[PDB]
Every structure is written in C-alpha cells, then in structure tokens.
C-alpha cells in the first residue's frame, strides 16, 4: 500500500513536470509569473487543482487528458 | 362512472371483453362510435403535461389506460392504422417522461407499428426519443451511452426490445439519424452488446 501511494505520487509528479515544461514553451506566460513554477516544483498538487487551475486556463488539453486518465474519469462526453 | 378508480377498472374490464378478433373490433367501434378514443388519448396527454410541469393513483389510471389500448391494438387489422393516427403522437410524448410505464407505452407503441413502409414516423420517434440528450463523440461507447442513459430500468429495456423487434421486422429509413449523428441502424445492435452479453448474469430465470 506504501507502493500504492508511491506510484500514484510518481504519476502526479510527472504531470507537473510536463505542465512545467510546457509553461516554458508557452509564450502566453510572463516570466515574472514565476510563481506558477515555484508552485509546480514546490509540491504535489490536487488533481482537481492541477486540472482546473492549470490545464484549463493554459489550455493544455494533452495534460488535462492525461490527468483524467490517472483520475480514471470515465465520462465519455467530458472525455470526448 | 367517472371516479378515477371506477374509470380505471372500467378500462380493464373492457380489455377482457376485447378478446376475439371479433370482439376487439366491437370494442374499437364502441369508443369510436356509440367516451371516445380521442378522450382517452387526451387523458394521457393531460397526464403527460401534469407530470412534466410538476418536475400511485395516476399509475393505476395510466397503467389501465395502456393495458386497454394494448389489448385492442394487438387484436385488430386496418383499424390499427386508425388508432395509430390518435395515440401514436401522444404515446411518444409520454415515453419521453420518466414514468415508472415507460416499458408499457413501448409495448403499446409496438402494437401500433404497421407492417408496411409507413414505419418511418415510428423510427424517427425512437431515434429522436436515445439521441436527443446524448452527446456523441466521433467513440462507439458514447452511442451506447445514449441508449443506456434513457433505457435505465429493466422494464424499459424489455419494452424497447419489443418495439425494436417490431420495427426491425422487415424495414427502416435510409440514413437514419441523419443530422444528429453518424447515421445508420448499427448503433442499435451495439446496444444489444450491453444487453445480451449480462443476460447470462440476470437476477430470475
């Protein structure tokens, strides 16, 4: 079960890394709003928090999709 | 006798009376000529509005209403079209409402379904009545979902199967579902995957 927690952690952490990487490429971002990166590197975040706060506002559709994978959100309409 | 309970038993008693192909014919005439069929559909229509506007007594009355329409429509001929056009439109509307009843109207609708080409109004109702709420992505599962969402309970499904069995008997419209979705009959069969796949795990032989 320790393993259970560890693996989930790895997965969520990875997502932040991806989001973090995209933030660099994205040109919609401002360097001074570094705060986001600080937040990303700083800790694991709630999935909803990651989804609602990051994915939607930064339109990272891919990330959103991957996140919902981990969540295991089935709803086909939303997924589609 | 107007009292709702007397009224519903009256409907039931007549159903029993409708038995022969011959008796069924008289029952047809009884309402048509010498309470009229129109009054009956009207009652169904009114209940429908009350139900939806709102969102046991009624179930008694409605269940009886349907039991009767079913009995006659089944044992009839050219007359079937006449009843079909008229309860068909109203029955379709009733089906949209939740109701416990859904299955029952489907059974009646099926009785109405005619052998010939003029199936089309019925197919449209069915597709429209699965398609309407559902959002379909471009995949298959979303289509199954449309059916699953609407046909929630066991009675709903059995009724649906009877209606479908009837419509599929020998014909349907081309490019069915055009406009709303990927067209064609195929998604309905997929739905049966939901059903007879499941059947093995019934309750209840």
Write the DSSP assignment of B117-178 as a string of letters.
STTHHHHHHHHH--TTT------HHHHHHHHHHH--SHHHHHHHHHHHHHHHTT---TTTTT
Largest alpha-carbon pair distance within chain A? 41
Euclidean distance between CA atoms B205 and B199, whole angstroms: 10
Is residue A58 within 8 Å of A22, Cβ to Cβ? yes
Experimental method: cryo-EM
Query: CA angle, B184 as apex, B170 and B202 as ends, to 5°?
Result: 75
- 3-state percent breakdown (helix, strand, coil) of chain A, nearest 5: 70, 0, 30
String of b and e for B5-23 (b: at least 16 CB within 10 Å)?
Answer: eebbebbbebbebbeeeee
**Structure-token match 């009624």, residue found:** B58
Tell me if chain B has a CB within 8 Å of the CB of A77.
Answer: yes
Hey, of A75, A76, A78, which one would you mutate to test binding to chain B, going by the most B CBs within 10 A of its CB?
Answer: A76
Helix and strand counts by DSSP (H, E) for chain B: 11, 0
> Which of B133, B141, B144, B148 should one mutate to test binding to chain A, selecting the residue with the greatest count of A CBs within 10 A?
B141
How much of chain B is in helix, strand and coil states, percent to nearest 5? Answer: 65, 0, 35
Resolution for this PDB entry, in angstroms: 21.4
Rounded Cα gap, residues B69 and B38, in angstroms: 12
Query: Is residue B107 a contact partner of residue B70, using CB atoms and an 8 Å limit?
Result: yes
Q: Taking the C-alpha atoms of B189, B190, B192 and B194 in order, what is their torsion angle to the nearest 10 degrees?
A: -170
- B165-169, long-range: CB within 8 Å, 24+ apart, which pairs? B165/B110, B166/B110, B166/B113, B167/B110, B167/B113, B167/B119, B167/B122, B167/B123, B167/B126, B169/B115
* B-chain residues near A76 (CB < 8 A): 137, 141-142, 145
Closest residue by Cα to residue B30 from B7, B14, B42: B14
């Amino acid at each position: 079960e320790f393993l259970h927690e560890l693996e989930e952690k790895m997965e969520v952490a990875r997502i932040q890394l991806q989001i973090q990487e995209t933030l660099q490429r994205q040109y919609s971002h401002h360097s001074s709003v570094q705060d986001a990166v600080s937040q990303l590197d700083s800790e694991l975040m709630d999935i909803t928090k990651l989804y609602g706060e990051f994915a939607d506002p930064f339109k990272l559709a891919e990330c959103k999709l991957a996140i919902i994978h981990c969540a295991g959100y089935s709803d086909p309409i939303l997924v589609q | 006798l107007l009292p709702p309970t007397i009224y519903i038993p009256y409907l039931k008693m007549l159903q029993g009376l409708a038995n022969g192909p011959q008796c069924a014919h008289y029952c047809f005439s009884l309402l048509k000529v010498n309470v009229s069929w129109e009054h009956f559909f009207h009652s169904l229509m009114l209940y429908h509005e009350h139900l939806r506007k709102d969102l046991q007594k009624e179930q008694d009355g409605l269940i009886a209403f349907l039991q009767l329409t079913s009995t006659i429509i089944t044992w009839s001929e050219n007359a079937r079209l006449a009843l079909c056009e008229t309860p068909v439109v109203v029955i379709l509307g009733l089906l949209q409402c939740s109701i416990p009843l859904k299955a029952e109207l489907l059974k009646t609708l099926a009785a109405f379904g005619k052998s010939p080409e003029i199936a089309a109004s019925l197919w449209q109702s069915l597709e429209y009545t699965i398609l309407q709420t559902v959002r379909i992505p471009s995949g298959i599962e979303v289509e199954l979902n449309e059916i699953e969402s609407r046909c929630e309970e066991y009675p709903l499904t059995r009724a649906f199967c009877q209606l479908i069995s009837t419509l599929v008997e020998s014909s349907f419209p081309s490019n069915l579902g055009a406009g709303l979705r990927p067209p064609g009959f195929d998604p309905y069969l997929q739905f049966l995957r939901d059903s007879v796949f499941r059947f093995r795990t019934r309750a209840r032989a």
